[PDB]
Amino acid sequence: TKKEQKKLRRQTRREAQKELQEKVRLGLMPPPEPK
RNA sequence: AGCUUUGCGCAGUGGCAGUAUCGUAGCCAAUGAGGUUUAUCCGAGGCGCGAUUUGCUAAUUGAAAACUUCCCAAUAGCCGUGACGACUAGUCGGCAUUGGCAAUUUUUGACAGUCUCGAGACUGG
């Protein structure tokens, strides 16, 4: 259902933001371009 | 092969964000939520409770705003004077420091403005 699409997308995106900030936390790269 | 539809995912431009976006593990819900319009019609979530990550930078207070200071002593132009020295009371060279260096020949400013085709003129009432 569409609410489950929103929840699955938002939790995949939350772990995606979490693992990008995780790879910033390890210090492999400076953070991406802010705009 | 190209066009294209629908759903989903990714990224990007822009817009919106407390009558917005959600969670709900409590209950109810297409075996029908919720309906004053059109009701022998419409058809999706509803009621409560509960929310509103991360990095960077600025500014303020504060003694201190969190990534491995202050203080004393000494060293880093010339005219005179004192010695030392040199050359004939005088002259010269270097050194030293116990006064001075804005009144025509110099270092405390006759300068400033104006106009004309490298060169001159005007004014400072």
Swiss-Prot record:
Highly expressed in retina, liver, kidney and blood. Detected at lower levels in heart and brain. Transmembrane segments: none annotated. It is found in: Nucleus; Nucleus speckle. Ubiquitinated. Undergoes 'Lys-63'-linked polyubiquitination by PRPF19 and deubiquitination by USP4. 'Lys-63'-linked ubiquitination increases the affinity for PRPF8 and may regulate the assembly of the U4/U6-U5 tri-snRNP complex. Component of the precatalytic spliceosome (spliceosome B complex). Component of the U4/U6-U5 tri-snRNP complex, a building block of the precatalytic spliceosome (spliceosome B complex). The U4/U6-U5 tri-snRNP complex is composed of the U4, U6 and U5 snRNAs and at least PRPF3, PRPF4, PRPF6, PRPF8, PRPF31, SNRNP200, TXNL4A, SNRNP40, SNRPB, SNRPD1, SNRPD2, SNRPD3, SNRPE, SNRPF, SNRPG, DDX23, CD2BP2, PPIH, SNU13, EFTUD2, SART1 and USP39, plus LSM2, LSM3, LSM4, LSM5, LSM6, LSM7 and LSM8. Interacts directly with PRPF4. It is linked to Retinitis pigmentosa 18: A retinal dystrophy belonging to the group of pigmentary retinopathies. Retinitis pigmentosa is characterized by retinal pigment deposits visible on fundus examination and primary loss of rod photoreceptor cells followed by secondary loss of cone photoreceptors. Patients typically have night vision blindness and loss of midperipheral visual field. As their condition progresses, they lose their far peripheral visual field and eventually central vision as well. Plays a role in pre-mRNA splicing as component of the U4/U6-U5 tri-snRNP complex that is involved in spliceosome assembly, and as component of the precatalytic spliceosome (spliceosome B complex). This is U4/U6 small nuclear ribonucleoprotein Prp3. The chain holds residues 441 to 475 of 683 of the full protein.
